[PDB]
Structure 1
Amino acid sequence: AELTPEVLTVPLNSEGKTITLTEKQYLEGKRLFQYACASCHVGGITKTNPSLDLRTETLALATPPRDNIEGLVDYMKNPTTYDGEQEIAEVHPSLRSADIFPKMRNLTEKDLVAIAGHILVEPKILGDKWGGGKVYY
């Protein structure tokens, strides 16, 4: 098995458009994920709130849908609760709260796209391991 462009093809927006990431984009996305997100989102689970995870189905059922690149980048800019009623940038890393979360200070939009692509590609590689926790270790 290889990292084919079919694997690296993920829905870009909610309409249906898709984006084929490069292998370098996926590697940099995984590196940025380990740098900024993995301390609480290691393996797709959420350490400080295990009720929510980073599986594609859970992101799809979020309001607004987060199972695409644009939705994930919007969350990285303006994170909300699961129903979208309350903004949680004061307690979640974001582009707006880069003052209090300094690891978001030097994140470009291409970096956010890479992190989003890594988040959307890892379930397609790992199966139920992504966002599954210690049962699937």
Structure 2
Amino acid sequence: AELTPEVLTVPLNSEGKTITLTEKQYLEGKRLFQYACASCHVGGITKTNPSLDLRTETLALATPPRDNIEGLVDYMKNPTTYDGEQEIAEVHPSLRSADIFPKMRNLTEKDLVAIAGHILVEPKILGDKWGGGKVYY
């Protein structure tokens, strides 16, 4: 098994357009995700709220759908609850709240895309392990 371009091809938007990431983009995504997100989302779960995970099936049923690059990037800009009803920037790290989550201050658009692509690619690799919690360790 290798990290092929097929693996690195992910939904860009809801319309079904794809983008193909580079190995460099994916690795940058993993590093940035470890930097900014893993303290809560290690392995695709959520420590401060285990009900919501980063599985693609879950992101797809979010409102608006988050199972694509644009969705994830928007979420990192202006996060909402799962039904889209509330804006949670005040309690979730995002570019909107980089004043109170200082680690978001040095993230660029390029970076958001990388993190997004990582979040989408990981489950294609790890399967149930991603978002599965300790049962699959």
Question: Under a length normalisation based on structure 2, what TM-score does the superposition of the two structures give?
Answer: 1.00
Q: CA deviation at 1:113?
A: 0.1
How many Å separate the matches in 2 of 1:74 and 1:126? 25
Q: What do the CA deviations read for 1:15-52 (whole angstroms, capped 9, x no partner)?
A: 00000000000000000000000000000000000000
Aligned residues: 137
Q: CA deviation at 1:73?
A: 0.1
Name stretches of at least 5 consecutive residues in structure 1 with no aligned partner.
Answer: none
Q: CA deviation at 1:133?
A: 0.2
Structure 1 stretches of 4+ with a deviation exceeding 6 A read none
Q: CA deviation at 1:89?
A: 0.1
How many Å separate the matches in 2 of 1:43 and 1:14? 25
**What's the % identity of the aligned pairs?**
100
RMSD of the alignment, in Å? 0.3
How many Å separate the matches in 2 of 1:58 and 1:4? 25
Q: CA deviation at 1:2?
A: 0.3
Q: What do the CA deviations read for 1:72-130 (whole angstroms, capped 9, x no partner)?
A: 00000000000000000000000010000000001000000000000000000000000
How many Å separate the matches in 2 of 1:81 and 1:106? 25
Secondary structure of 1:30 counterpart: helix
Secondary structure of 2:123 counterpart: helix
Name stretches of at least 5 consecutive residues in structure 2 with no aligned partner.
Answer: none
Question: Under a length normalisation based on structure 1, what TM-score does the superposition of the two structures give?
Answer: 1.00
How many Å separate the matches in 1 of 2:2 and 2:77? 32
How many Å separate the matches in 2 of 1:121 and 1:30? 10
